[PDB]
Amino acid sequence: KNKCVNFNFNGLKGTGVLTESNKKFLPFQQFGRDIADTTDAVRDPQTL
């Protein structure tokens, strides 16, 4: 966390900084999105 790295969550390749998020997610919701339809919030597949 807090470092520019390459992340790969189930095939969502990308580059960015991963920080802890307090965004409430409904148990059905897996990933968030912003206005430009780009992923800005992810759920770790192993550690919830």
Add this chain to the structure above:
Amino acid sequence: QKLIANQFNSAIGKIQDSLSSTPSALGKLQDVVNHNAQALNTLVKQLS
């Protein structure tokens, strides 16, 4: 002279109220702000 100085001061005192009460008195300047933001939202939103 005394009357003319009074008329000027009353005229000044109404300007403070006129702009405050009327909402669309500064519509020309608010148009500059709105057009700039609307263009950038359209540019961002057009990424989907």
